[PDB]
Symmetry: none
Subunit: 130 residues, 10 copies
């Protein structure tokens, strides 16, 4: 199609970016598809999991959407029209894992028109001593 | 109103024997958006060799210690007239009456089978 | 960019607009979204109820669409695209209630790329 | 939406139109919707039922499409775009019922944009 | 394939619906066509006239849009696509005429793939006490 | 239609905001229309005029785009599709006029589907010490 | 309303001399759908060396023995702020005042004159 | 685009198909374009001309639409949307020319989306003696 | 009215087009329909096969998408609208087979308003 | 959001691909924009030129569309919507030039919501065999 690739933005929004501290992460996914009617899912790297106090576009996640022991957040019927669609997953009050770089992925897995249907983005968790 | 049919389809209906169960849910109206959910009674479980409308269950569709099977209603599933869950090669539990349930979580139905004494 | 708002029109289409007389009321709803799939719902004020002789887009309401003692009418799998979608709820052969102003609501509860805020509209029933 | 009402044509296409003789019936439904992604069903009147040798747009009906003891034929995901869609159900090698008028119905029951989503058409089975 | 019909809604939106009082009237027209480019026209019944304090889609009418002594309001280069086009004429702070039912019309006079037949809608002005 | 109102942003983007000093002004218009194929015009208030060193989306204005003695800048065929269109008029190297508030306007004047086709925005020009 | 400007733009304004004329129609509104039409008085004619907004006239655009120039308003023309007809390298006719007309013919008129000088 | 080629159907609808007799011709042109906003024109072969008693979609031709000595009938802004458009030119009460095969053409000359933007179709005018 | 047809392009995009050398092949398929939802399928000629290092629209193929011993590649839930849909199958770092002409196929097996007939395209592998 | 890019394919469609033989070449261009209206232009490499026997979307080129001594072919009022527009320039019955690789370009010079960057594609003309 006439639109660009799917995009994903990942950022630590909480005050702390340090390993083993409480913080918040926001993952903003834009399919950038002419049309989508299909499955969309976020895959979280080891160190991060979703639960029902996390939100998608401001609404609490439902257990039916959280799969693979908190690693997968799936929307079975995910709308997009001319790249207007957006899925913002907020991971609230998480204990950040060990220092290092962590990569998140989001993908439209079915029923989408576009040139590339997945995207990845990373965050850096900082060391306790610098 | 929705219907659920539950049948032991293997040759044997007797406690602790090897058999097959078939659970056929029919909403009889159209499904709305949501997640089709079967509940099996304690003594029955599903695994990834069982099937839903001819397709192997995925691990993500089974939880609650094997007693719950979920099928989120993607656009291509919404219009189905029927959801047929085949529980294959099971060891039947102790004699008694067992009630199976199915609903569209966002159209409740239930049915029972009788497992025979040896 | 910024998205538009839903609209609702509430129209007494029968010849009479007078209290305690027979008439028809038509409620025209446009959720006015880029794309929506799922539940849309009309809410009727006290004085008006829906039954299976009333219609949605020309077709008789089903029992399962009529909730909360006739005050709620649901379209469970509505579709909207570019604001072209439209739902016409026609309340047929109703005895209009006491003179006054009556407000109807229609709301978008679907999967939606759009502004889901409800729309309202009113009719005036005239005194005998 | 900008299109007209759904339409249904119903015709006895076999050489005989006489009660208790073999013939074929063709039912041509046009949803006339801006977009459809939902369920479409034909409803057959008493005296006519469908089986897996009958066809939808030339393809044999699947068992999963035939509901309510053969009275209902469903396309569970029935596409339309600006009224380009069409569903032609052919009831083949049927023994016509008693003489009289028989009314068929077809409708989009979900996920469709349009002003009227059902249509009816009838056939006359001749005496003798 | 058959095409749909245009729609017009006419509403007294101000608090008062009584003859010889001030109120506002809104006219919402959807030509409801696959594709239209060109002239669309509202026609107001005697008792109601347009001026440059009235608005089309939130913007003041130009003198050139008001014809036939305030009876006709034209959108010379309207556009419609898939029935998504909409024109809202708002008659601001008008003195309502004598009690009765008044019928407004809107017509599609454009290049069009669609049903160009006019739409109509009425309002009821109530009697003084 | 399903989009919101047209928007206009107006900002003095040069270093100076002071009356009678050199600066640049940037006017960003979003028609926010389902589809536009028509005329779009910026209207500049007294104190500002356009010439061919000014730009529309980075391109020098053509003489035929500048009307009404520099007061009006036209895009004669101004595309929009689902609000993706944008028109950025940059007024380059201008002498700001006397201190006060100045209001700019932009509008789709024809062949557009939308709910509100014009927008205004202002800038404040500061007094010299 | 709509205006028309008629001006002799070449060196000479005198009967029988070679010069240039500019006819500039400015709707002060926008154009409506229709046909842009210029009417030249006897003594002036258009040909395919003349131009409308910088484009050479086409044969189908000129009729009435070169005295009428007609441009049906296709979508790409509608938005124009002006229609400028350039009559290039012409022989000015006998001395007198000559009136040009231009209008947008629609299914829903302007004038200007030049003085050609006696030699 | 996803639609087929422009089509043109040409037929003598009058009772007589014979050379030098009065008859009527109907030319039905379908651009079959996803979208058109451009110029559309019919081209008539020598032997046939248009005038203002002829009609386009039931409306009298205007003199501004008839060009090249009655051989060209042009619409400057010709709409189509997903192939729903049609231009039916009725040539009314013409004197059929000499016996032979005559080919008509219609085309979209600008601002159209599609795979083929012109079509041709012929009619046969019969001999007075057979 | 009448519909258009699908298109397939097949291109050697690697540096070499020579038999027995390493290269990349890209197949660009447009089913070119008004609306489609469902299975689309590419078929590769003897000499070329797909594995999970090859990609569809930039994403590695899944084992379940590769069938018939590497000869068939399926997109099970493709979507098309107004001929805007496109599928790009890239065969990465393949050893080109013997000099000659090789023909690829792509077919629409979906629910479709449109011409489902397959599209073909060929590449020429050059002699050393 | 972000936009996609235009595509060009170049295909020798005649039976022969060998230098100095007669063949046909077809260039398929998709500007791939949300909305475009105006000029699109093809550029042919040395060894190929256009004339009025070549076609665009199956219709003979006009002299006014062929510029720079046959090197440039313009569509002056192209239309694109949602990446559905497509232009096919067919070079008919050409004598193929010397064996080698030949690169064609197509560019969007229109009013556009879209990425107007040019697209390129090449063909290989084969050596004659011995
Ligand atoms: Cl896309
Ligand atoms: Cl519709
Ligand atoms: Cl809009
Ligand atoms: Cl011409
Ligand atoms: Cl003279
Ligand atoms: Cl097309
Ligand atoms: Cl006629
Ligand atoms: Cl895999
Ligand atoms: Cl392509
Ligand atoms: Cl030749």
């Amino acid at each position: 199609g006439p639109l660009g690739s799917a995009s994903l933005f990942a950022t630590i929004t909480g005050a702390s970016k340090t390993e083993w501290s409480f913080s918040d992460i926001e993952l903003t996914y834009r399919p950038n598809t002419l049309l989508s009617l299909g499955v969309m899912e976020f895959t979280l790297p080891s160190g991060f999991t979703a639960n029902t106090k996390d939100t998608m576009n401001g609404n609490a996640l439902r257990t039916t959407q959280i799969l693979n022991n908190g690693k997968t957040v799936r929307v079975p019927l995910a709308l997009d029209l001319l790249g207007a669609g957006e899925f913002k997953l907020k991971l609230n009050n998480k204990t950040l894992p060990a220092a290092g770089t962590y990569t998140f992925r989001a993908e439209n897995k079915s029923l989408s028109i576009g040139n590339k249907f997945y995207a990845e983005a990373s965050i850096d968790v900082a060391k306790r001593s610098t």
